[PDB]
Ligand binder design. Structure first.
Ligand code: CL
Ligand code: NA
Length: 98
């Protein structure tokens, strides 16, 4: 806070180049966020800087919420999470800017 919280979306279809990650995302898809936290779009000059912050904030919040419940993410989870959140952040930027 005060961060903006976007609407829940369907978790994106992503073809990971790493075949094991690709399978892992599908197997464990519900572990990952389906909404992103961000600072308002109009505070940014470009998509890249927005997404950078959106990814950091969203990953921080999801990891914090998870750890305090006594659950864990694997190294593979984190890699997949960063990519999933990146895509949702890009979608959020393009949408909210439109
Ligand atoms: Cl979903
Ligand atoms: Na591959």
């Amino acid at each position: 806070g005060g961060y903006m919280l976007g609407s829940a979306m369907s978790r994106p279809l992503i073809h990971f180049g790493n075949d094991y990650e690709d399978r892992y995302y599908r197997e464990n898809m519900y572990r990952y966020p389906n909404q992103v936290y961000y600072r308002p779009v109009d505070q940014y000059n470009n998509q890249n800087n927005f997404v950078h912050d959106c990814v950091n904030i969203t990953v921080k919040q999801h990891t914090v919420t998870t750890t305090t419940k006594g659950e864990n993410f694997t190294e593979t989870d984190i890699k997949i999470m960063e990519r999933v959140v990146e895509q949702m952040c890009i979608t959020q930027y393009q949408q909210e800017s439109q």
